[PDB]
């Protein structure tokens, strides 16, 4: 039973999941489009979009939350200086998931996830 539970385990333990989504959020912010498996993209929405919302309000405390999250000043700077203002009016849905077939190596369902204003 997993009634009403949320969040995919992705065959990883909690620390690995957290680290992987930290990395993947960084990649998505810096490249604005990344190709990942469909479940990872779907879980990545829930990690990246809250970062962008946080970046909407620029403050020292917000930047330190966005750094505690994502652990990257490159990424934090890009968030608060570009993505925050780029998405200043848009209420949610900063990302777009485009299914793109299957990975050759293992037949994984692949998907492009990108910022909507790229």
């Amino acid at each position: 039973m997993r009634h009403r539970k949320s969040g995919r385990q992705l065959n990883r333990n909690s620390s690995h999941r957290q680290a992987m989504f930290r990395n993947m959020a960084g990649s998505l912010v810096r490249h604005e489009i990344i190709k990942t498996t469909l479940p990872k993209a779907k879980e990545l929405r829930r990690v990246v979009e809250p970062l962008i919302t946080l970046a909407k309000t620029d403050s020292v405390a917000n930047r330190r939350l966005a750094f505690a999250r994502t652990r990257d000043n490159e990424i934090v700077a890009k968030l608060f200086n570009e993505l925050g203002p780029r998405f200043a009016s848009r209420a949610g849905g900063y990302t777009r998931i485009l299914k793109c077939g299957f990975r050759a190596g293992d037949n994984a369902p692949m998907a492009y996830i990108e910022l909507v204003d790229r």
């Binding site: 489009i33 485009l98 299914k99 793109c100 077939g101 492009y112």
Partner: protein
């Protein structure tokens, strides 16, 4: 535990009666590029719903 009797080619075929692959029902055709693709998947040329979504 293991069989006592070699199962027949008949029983092997009966078990495999559910192993057949299902072909894709039909492909979608992008309104702009005209390329066929899986529905809800981008085309090989990076189109989706008439939009060039990925360059190259």
């Amino acid at each position: 535990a293991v069989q006592q009797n070699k199962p027949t080619r008949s029983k092997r075929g009966m078990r495999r009666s559910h192993d057949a692959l299902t072909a894709v029902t039909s492909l979608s055709v992008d309104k702009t590029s005209g390329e066929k693709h899986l529905r809800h998947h981008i085309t090989a040329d990076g189109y989706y719903r008439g939009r060039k979504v990925i360059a190259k």
